[PDB]
Amino acid sequence: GSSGSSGPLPIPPPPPDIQPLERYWAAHQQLRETDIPQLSQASRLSTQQVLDWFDSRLPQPAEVSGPSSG
Known about the structure:
about 70 residues; mainly alpha; Arc Repressor Mutant, subunit A; 3 helices; elongated; Homeobox and leucine zipper protein Homez
């Protein structure tokens, strides 16, 4: 945790964590406007990032073999 910056910018920030959404997804498999901002903060991503993450995960309209779920 630190702040402040001038001319020469400090080293670049580390990569985000998708684990937060990965677990939550398989855990509940339901994105909520309330869990959107809460999760995004964990994965260190933008509110839009999480929205696209789940949206992309969801079953898109297309021809698929047939994944066994239950």
